[PDB]
Design an enzyme around this catalytic site. Structure first.
Site, mmCIF file in Angstrom:
data_model
loop_
_atom_site.group_PDB
_atom_site.id
_atom_site.type_symbol
_atom_site.label_atom_id
_atom_site.label_comp_id
_atom_site.label_asym_id
_atom_site.label_seq_id
_atom_site.Cartn_x
_atom_site.Cartn_y
_atom_site.Cartn_z
ATOM 1 N N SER A 33 0.869 -1.192 0.000
ATOM 2 C CA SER A 33 0.000 0.000 0.000
ATOM 3 C C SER A 33 0.897 1.230 0.000
ATOM 4 O O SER A 33 1.767 1.342 -0.879
ATOM 5 C CB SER A 33 -0.991 -0.057 1.168
ATOM 6 O OG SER A 33 -1.877 1.039 1.087
ATOM 7 N N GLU A 88 -8.498 -5.314 -4.902
ATOM 8 C CA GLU A 88 -7.962 -4.206 -4.122
ATOM 9 C C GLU A 88 -9.053 -3.260 -3.638
ATOM 10 O O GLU A 88 -8.902 -2.640 -2.579
ATOM 11 C CB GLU A 88 -6.915 -3.444 -4.943
ATOM 12 C CG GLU A 88 -5.733 -4.294 -5.426
ATOM 13 C CD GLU A 88 -4.729 -4.648 -4.324
ATOM 14 O OE1 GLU A 88 -5.010 -4.406 -3.125
ATOM 15 O OE2 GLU A 88 -3.647 -5.176 -4.662
ATOM 16 N N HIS A 106 -7.334 -5.871 -0.203
ATOM 17 C CA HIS A 106 -6.192 -4.995 0.041
ATOM 18 C C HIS A 106 -5.579 -5.248 1.416
ATOM 19 O O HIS A 106 -6.217 -4.987 2.448
ATOM 20 C CB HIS A 106 -6.645 -3.543 -0.085
ATOM 21 C CG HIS A 106 -5.528 -2.542 -0.143
ATOM 22 N ND1 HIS A 106 -4.574 -2.542 -1.137
ATOM 23 C CD2 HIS A 106 -5.255 -1.468 0.635
ATOM 24 C CE1 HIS A 106 -3.754 -1.522 -0.962
ATOM 25 N NE2 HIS A 106 -4.151 -0.849 0.100
HETATM 26 C C1 LIG Z 1 -17.139 8.862 2.077
HETATM 27 O O1 LIG Z 1 -15.761 8.508 2.240
HETATM 28 C C2 LIG Z 1 -15.244 8.878 3.455
HETATM 29 C C3 LIG Z 1 -15.287 8.050 4.572
HETATM 30 C C4 LIG Z 1 -14.743 8.500 5.775
HETATM 31 C C5 LIG Z 1 -14.767 7.667 6.890
HETATM 32 N N1 LIG Z 1 -13.622 6.759 6.709
HETATM 33 C C6 LIG Z 1 -12.377 7.115 7.059
HETATM 34 O O2 LIG Z 1 -12.095 8.186 7.594
HETATM 35 C C7 LIG Z 1 -11.288 6.089 6.747
HETATM 36 C C8 LIG Z 1 -11.600 4.774 7.439
HETATM 37 C C9 LIG Z 1 -10.584 3.733 6.976
HETATM 38 C C10 LIG Z 1 -9.627 3.417 8.125
HETATM 39 C C11 LIG Z 1 -9.627 1.910 8.364
HETATM 40 C C12 LIG Z 1 -8.190 1.425 8.446
HETATM 41 C C13 LIG Z 1 -8.218 -0.091 8.491
HETATM 42 N N2 LIG Z 1 -7.037 -0.635 7.794
HETATM 43 C C14 LIG Z 1 -6.970 -1.512 6.768
HETATM 44 C C15 LIG Z 1 -5.745 -1.559 6.079
HETATM 45 C C16 LIG Z 1 -5.603 -2.434 4.983
HETATM 46 N N3 LIG Z 1 -6.605 -3.253 4.667
HETATM 47 C C17 LIG Z 1 -7.765 -3.273 5.322
HETATM 48 C C18 LIG Z 1 -8.718 -4.186 4.888
HETATM 49 C C19 LIG Z 1 -9.953 -4.258 5.521
HETATM 50 CL CL1 LIG Z 1 -11.188 -5.388 4.957
HETATM 51 C C20 LIG Z 1 -10.220 -3.423 6.604
HETATM 52 C C21 LIG Z 1 -9.256 -2.519 7.033
HETATM 53 C C22 LIG Z 1 -8.002 -2.413 6.412
HETATM 54 C C23 LIG Z 1 -4.373 -2.489 4.237
HETATM 55 C C24 LIG Z 1 -3.710 -1.216 4.632
HETATM 56 C C25 LIG Z 1 -3.788 -0.146 3.819
HETATM 57 C C26 LIG Z 1 -4.550 0.862 4.444
HETATM 58 C C27 LIG Z 1 -4.804 2.028 3.686
HETATM 59 C C28 LIG Z 1 -4.941 0.744 5.850
HETATM 60 C C29 LIG Z 1 -4.694 -0.698 6.244
HETATM 61 C C30 LIG Z 1 -3.332 -1.119 6.067
HETATM 62 C C31 LIG Z 1 -14.139 9.756 5.854
HETATM 63 C C32 LIG Z 1 -14.093 10.581 4.736
HETATM 64 C C33 LIG Z 1 -14.644 10.133 3.539
HETATM 65 O O3 LIG Z 1 -14.632 10.894 2.408
#
Ligand SMILES: COc1cc(CNC(=O)CCCCCCCNc2c3c(nc4cc(Cl)ccc24)C[C@H]2C[C@H](C)C[C@@H]3C2)ccc1O
Ligand SMILES: COc1cc(CNC(=O)CCCCCCCNc2c3c(nc4cc(Cl)ccc24)C[C@H]2C[C@H](C)C[C@@H]3C2)ccc1O
Ligand SMILES: CC(=O)N[C@@H]1[C@@H](O)[C@H](O)[C@@H](CO)O[C@H]1O
Ligand SMILES: CC(=O)N[C@@H]1[C@@H](O)[C@H](O)[C@@H](CO)O[C@H]1O
Ligand SMILES: CC(=O)N[C@@H]1[C@@H](O)[C@H](O)[C@@H](CO)O[C@H]1O
Ligand SMILES: CC(=O)N[C@@H]1[C@@H](O)[C@H](O)[C@@H](CO)O[C@H]1O
Ligand SMILES: *[C@@H]1O[C@H](CO)[C@@H](O)[C@H](O)[C@H]1NC(C)=O
Ligand SMILES: [Cl-]
Ligand SMILES: [Cl-]
Ligand SMILES: [Cl-]
Lengths: 532, 532
Positions: free
Chosen positions: B197, B324, B437
């Site tokens: 990533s 992904e 991913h």
């Molecule tokens: C409408 O959209 C929007 C939505 C929001 C609200 N969401 C947010 O603020 C982000 C939440 C995500 C964090 C969750 C982190 C969980 N880490 C995960 C990671 C990876 N695989 C994952 C696979 C799954 Cl199955 C679940 C969580 C994962 C592979 C990696 C690579 C990564 C990029 C992080 C990480 C390491 C805010 C603004 C928006 O515009």
């Protein structure tokens, strides 16, 4: 007596012709307009002045002046489309085939030949009306109309060369049928107009034009529709092309009057010789002199008319062939040959795309290329050939017709759509060309019924089914005979969008004819070209 | 003795850890930089001042300050990614696993965690390096770096918050490895960096950046590449987002020094609390604070660097996972849920497209929609879901990586490409998400070798195969052991473009990974957007 008919324009004497071990009556070469010669070249047609005595209507008339194809001299597959009679500007005649004995008041079908608005004849062997008239007991008419610059030179503003006079020739012939067909045993209230290619576009143009709607009952369109990219031009482009015709002949370009007077002094073949030179681009499936969107024959743009429902509301039966594009690629694009499999190199593919969509910018050409290229296998000469075939057919025939069918069905009174995909057992053209533009006509006109022509028994049966569909549609507005136990051709509806294949196999009903590609041609690509 | 190592910065005392049925040496939480706290927030890192006494390296360090995911509290599938140690700005540490007994000068592998540049920890269970170090007899290092605003707030021109300091953290850890790894039994001439990533993007960025190239030998990139659309911003956009972070926190915006001074007074959670509010669009797979194309870490644009070959020429091994996109859709797009099959209505499909390609105009969105919609079947919720999943994965990971791979292979010294498409038998996420991913990582780190984790025998074999490919590539520049009789992973070449699947089935070689969609994303769509 049976062959002597008095018309509102005068008497005609027809001829008794043999047809499949029986006979019927033919009235060949009846004039419906004054000869559009001399000072009448480019002018709206005038009704034929009544004659005294008896018009001898036992032989085919002259064909209109037109470009003649000499690409394959003597080859049957091309020569069958060339004029088989002497060419003359004195060409506004129609032909009638009447069942014997004469019907009281039977359904009428009026054939409008195609040919890109630059060619065509009522007299081709493949348009012989006797089989359809005899087999289905209809009164079959074939009209004629001026083609090329003679029918569609357009100098908007001028009453001397207004444009669309070939469409007005068709109308005047339809008006004659309206006035006179009762005397031949036809019902003027049950006239079906049908045509292929530019004849199909014409049929749709009469659906659209207010001046034409009351001259026919319903309509059949084959491999052509009024909105096709090749089927009309703006008054500006029509003007530009007329002036470029003058410039090509050292004409006075000062004014409409001087340009027209100059063009009227030329022998017809001097016009024909330079006709292709006025096109704006190297292109295939593009024709110099075609209908103009004028504000008279067509009150407004075709798209606004279709959107508003400003057209005749009736029943239509229409469709396409599987490989509309192949004929135009053979004649105009690099790498195609009638004597080889015509596997297309990637370079020739890109060249064909630009010829097939000549009005596109580079972004548009990229879009077309991407839509029709398999990038796992881009040097496959067969996929490149078939991809280009699909490009030409989809853009020029299939997707225009699907756009028309979808707009029309919103307001019409019944739509029946077909997909003709039978390759004839005795075709003289090579296998790669598939089901070619024009080659459903021989089935519509019953040629497979002639044993000498060497069609299969299944092709005879297909022709008989097609003739019965077309004639039952003409009679009733429905190709099906209800209460019968044959497979039923379903209505095309806005929601289910059904259509049938026409071939020698039991019927199959499908939905959304070539929807994926036509979304690209009808919605995405025009937006891309309107943005850039 | 084995656990006591004198480094150039001071003495460190490791710990003897069990691995499977054996043991190895672990040095956890070794500092490589001064704590970037106080007036050093947003600043380039400075080398850790040497210490007297023995550093206790028996315990994992703190994790960097970051957004914590609370969507699914207590759920193992999401909690496995959250910090499992206290968070602190005092977080620039590295961890080392050494085979026992200590090797003389063996291959080094340095792991760079991903997490979109806004999250991630060297100390997650899934990054435990003992199994890889033990099984493949390599010295495994995991570094840390500042994420979010702490790592990537960019006010170009200021030396107090220049941008890219998270990348400089990684460089300083690489410089530490270069300087000290020989004292742990590692060959600093044979260091492979690898990451997933944002870690994969980072690895590619160190390939590009001149100041990084001499600190490693070769590189592995998993599900990320330096040119990804989420992986960098211009100096103007980083500046915009830095000012917007200040505005969200009522900061003085008059000057860089006043803004930075204000931001340095906030507690870490105050910045994190508003981090997401600075994005220019409703979006998914977009992150707020990411590397800037600054003219210093990156001499020129990434595209021009790749075009001219201005990058380190070595061997690379890299690849992607089948699905992904699904994680990002689950978290940020309407219609998705971890407790359902998430069949996607057409309305939600179009909403997701806008979130997935936030920078596109309406013509661009139409293009993407057409490319991924089956218009024979546009109301199929499964196809709509899977189409959206492909869009996200193709746009953000797969096609950017294929662009990088094609550009790099023109100049590089050996490319090996993989496609990971094994769905783990014990996955806690639902079936619709496929091969997610991040979920190849557990296989790279040998977690299937732990019986208590409930992988199948075949998954243990697959992990051992992958670990061996990764370690053998790290040692030799080639994942294959020649003279052996396993099937050979072939070099990706410009002409044949071969890659392999990574799964439990015998290896298959394919060519042109998702070439059809990546022509769209890499060539046609950017041309469309640049013209419109
Ligand atoms: C409408 O959209 C929007 C939505 C929001 C609200 N969401 C947010 O603020 C982000 C939440 C995500 C964090 C969750 C982190 C969980 N880490 C995960 C990671 C990876 N695989 C994952 C696979 C799954 Cl199955 C679940 C969580 C994962 C592979 C990696 C690579 C990564 C990029 C992080 C990480 C390491 C805010 C603004 C928006 O515009
Ligand atoms: C630079 O741009 C270019 C410009 C040009 C200019 N074209 C020329 O000079 C030759 C014209 C040839 C017309 C030959 C007409 C033969 N009638 C044919 C017709 C039809 N089916 C055919 C099917 C085959 Cl298999 C062969 C001939 C056919 C169905 C019809 C519908 C029609 C439109 C005509 C007609 C009736 C050419 C190439 C270019 O690249
Ligand atoms: C009334 C009359 O003179 N008819 C003749 C007809 O006999 C002849 O067969 C043909 C000549 O082309 O048509 C004409
Ligand atoms: C002092 C030492 O050698 N190791 C210690 C360990 O005993 C202690 O439990 C842990 C928690 O602070 O920190 C470390
Ligand atoms: C896959 C690849 O490019 N291998 C090259 C090889 O061809 C070349 O001989 C050598 C020295 O330049 O470097 C390495
Ligand atoms: C990590 C894990 O789930 N381990 C399980 C264990 O908890 C369970 O008791 C057993 C039942 O077969 O299977 C295994
Ligand atoms: C055609 O029009 C008639 C008369 O209104 C109507 O009853 C019939 O349902 C229409 N048919 C179709 C297919 O629209
Ligand atoms: Cl006969
Ligand atoms: Cl263990
Ligand atoms: Cl190569």
């Amino acid at each position: 007596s049976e062959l002597l008919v008095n018309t509102k324009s005068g008497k005609v004497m027809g001829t008794r012709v043999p047809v499949l071990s029986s006979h019927i009556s033919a009235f060949l070469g009846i004039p419906f307009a004054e000869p559009p010669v001399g000072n009448m070249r480019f002018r709206r047609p005038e009704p034929k002045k009544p004659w005294s005595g008896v018009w001898n209507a036992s032989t085919y008339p002259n064909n209109c002046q037109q470009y003649v194809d000499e690409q394959f001299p003597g080859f049957s597959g091309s020569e069958m489309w060339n004029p088989n009679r002497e060419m003359s500007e004195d060409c506004l005649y129609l032909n009638i085939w009447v069942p014997s004995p004469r019907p009281k008041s039977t359904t009428v079908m009026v054939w409008i030949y195609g040919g890109g608005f630059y060619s065509g004849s009522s007299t081709l062997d493949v348009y012989n009306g006797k089989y359809l008239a005899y087999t289905e007991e209809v009164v079959l008419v074939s009209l004629s109309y001026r083609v090329g610059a003679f029918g569609f030179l357009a100098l908007h503003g001028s009453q001397e060369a207004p444009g669309n006079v070939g469409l007005l020739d068709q109308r005047m012939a339809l008006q004659w049928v309206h006035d006179n067909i009762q005397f031949f045993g036809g019902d003027p209230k049950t006239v079906t107009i049908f045509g292929e290619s530019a004849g199909g576009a014409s049929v749709g143009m009469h659906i659209l034009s207010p001046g034409s709607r009351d001259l026919f009952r319903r309509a059949i369109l084959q491999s052509g529709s009024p909105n096709c990219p090749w089927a009309s031009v703006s008054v500006a482009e029509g003007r530009r092309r007329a002036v470029e015709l003058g410039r090509n002949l050292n004409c006075n370009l000062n004014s409409d009057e001087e340009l027209i007077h100059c063009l009227r002094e030329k022998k017809p073949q001097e016009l024909i010789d330079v006709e292709w030179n006025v096109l704006p681009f190297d292109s295939i499936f593009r024709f110099s002199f075609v209908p103009v969107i004028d504000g008279e024959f067509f009150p407004t743009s075709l798209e606004s008319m279709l959107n508003s429902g400003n057209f005749k509301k009736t029943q239509i039966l229409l469709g396409v062939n599987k490989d509309e594009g192949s004929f135009f690629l053979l004649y105009g694009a690099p790498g195609f040959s009638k004597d080889s499999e015509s596997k297309i190199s990637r370079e020739d593919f890109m060249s064909g795309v630009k010829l097939s969509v000549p009005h596109a910018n580079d972004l548009g050409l990229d879009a077309v290329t991407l839509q029709y290229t398999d990038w796992m296998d881009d040097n496959n000469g067969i996929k490149n050939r078939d991809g280009l075939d699909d490009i030409v057919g989809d853009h020029n025939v299939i997707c225009p017709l699907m756009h028309f069918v979808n707009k029309y069905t919103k307001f019409g009174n019944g739509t029946y759509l077909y997909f003709f995909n039978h390759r004839a057992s005795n075709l003289v053209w090579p296998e790669w060309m598939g089901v070619i533009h024009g080659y459903e006509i021989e089935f519509v006109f019953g040629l497979p019924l002639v044993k000498e022509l060497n069609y299969t028994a299944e092709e005879e049966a297909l022709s008989r089914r097609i003739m019965h569909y077309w004639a039952t549609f003409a009679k009733t507005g429905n190709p099906n005979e209800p209460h019968s136990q044959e497979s039923k051709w379903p209505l095309f509806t806005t929601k289910e969008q059904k259509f049938i294949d026409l071939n020698t196999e039991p019927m199959k009903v499908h939905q959304r004819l070539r929807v994926q590609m036509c979304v690209f041609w009808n919605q995405f690509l025009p937006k891309l070209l309107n943005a850039t």
